[PDB]
A paper describes a structure:
Here we investigate the mechanism of fast inactivation in the Shaker Kv channel using cryo-electron microscopy, mass spectrometry and electrophysiology. We resolved structures of a fully inactivated state in which the non-polar end of the N terminus plugs the internal pore in an extended conformation. The N-terminal methionine is deleted, leaving an alanine that is acetylated and interacts with a pore-lining isoleucine residue where RNA editing regulates fast inactivation. Opening of the internal activation gate is required for fast inactivation because it enables the plug domain to block the pore and repositions gate residues to interact with and stabilize that domain.
After refinement using C4 symmetry, the cryo-EM data enabled us to determine the structure of the WT Shaker Kv channel at 2.73 Å resolution, which could be further improved by separately refining the transmembrane domain to 2.67 Å and the cytoplasmic T1 domain to 2.98 Å. These maps were of similar quality throughout, sufficient for de novo model building, with clearly resolved densities for many side chains.
Numbering used by the authors:
A (entry chain A), B (entry chain C), C (entry chain B), D (entry chain D): 83 to 91, 96 to 194
């Protein structure tokens, strides 16, 4: 029931979820290897080479919880502003991990 | 009960809903012909020629659901932060389609 | 139970509520004379002469409803993300009008 | 049951909570000495010297209440969009004060 959250001081990345910009350090994304955002191989497709940011044309009220999963170091909880289906599709897209997906489902 | 969401790679448009900026690809808006945002004829009035963006002086907490309708490929659901009257007026303004309007009403 | 919302085409003003920027036309603000935002006399104090915007160091989740009152042409309603006390203090500060204040109180 | 909120006119600071920018006057932060944001000693670590802003890689839906605590002059209350578990860790990080933390818990 306890998780670790990254402390500041290195490299900061900007994630643009359909106009909503999110800024986090790379160490936040590197906490969880695998996943769409964890490794550069599965996030090079969504990286815009000109704006120096990651663009996702998806629901913006969900990346608040998706980002907090990396920040909180494992706390995945759906905010009560979006349906369960929408968040399930979002977490399936971001590939948070089979164990994490099952844990979230059992928490719902 | 299933819908299709656009995949990334072309042209991206900025929609400014009373200060809240939304960025989506043109393919997201072109999923639904007709509608205010689907075709250029009904959205040239709201396009600002100088800022290169679409300005709508309306309720900003509703275009989250309006935009997701294009992103989710047909999923129109009202977020629980605005009343049914406000969202009904918004969807009537954006002209989401008589079938879509009736489907949303029967879902409420 | 019916209200009128301004149509687009003149001058647009930016209202910065503690970092959250809101853009509306003057016709939206001029719908209600009196009030803090309706007349230039009661909003010159909060106007930043350098950034060409109005700054209010107040709760940002309330100006969504405060702004919609001008947009919707008289529809004042508290969103369910802030308490009644906070919204009452906000509407008292913005001076929405004694009749409007009483109408909102009787609607709560 | 009454609190004082700062009036405008001096120095304004920008707080970037994981991409979400908050702007407040320094007098808002100086209302409460001690705390992470009250004194420069405990906020120099989180100040970005290049962007001239304070960066916190934490949950952005929680700093609305943390900022309002300084604005409202002592009104600390968790918005109903984030869990009590998440907010308790947030207020502990910002070190709102031993009396204030216990007051919030007794209010929950």
């Amino acid at each position: 029931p306890q998780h670790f959250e990254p402390i500041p001081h290195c490299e900061r990345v900007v994630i643009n979820v359909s106009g909503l910009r999110f800024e986090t350090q790379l160490r936040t994304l590197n906490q969880f290897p695998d996943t769409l955002l964890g490794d550069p191989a599965r996030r090079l497709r969504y990286f815009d080479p000109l704006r120096n940011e990651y663009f996702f044309d998806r629901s913006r009220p969900s990346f608040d919880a998706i980002l907090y999963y990396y920040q909180s170091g494992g706390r995945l909880r759906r905010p009560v502003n979006v349906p369960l289906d929408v968040f399930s599709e979002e977490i399936k897209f971001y590939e948070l991990g089979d164990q994490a997906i099952n844990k979230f489902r059992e928490d719902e």
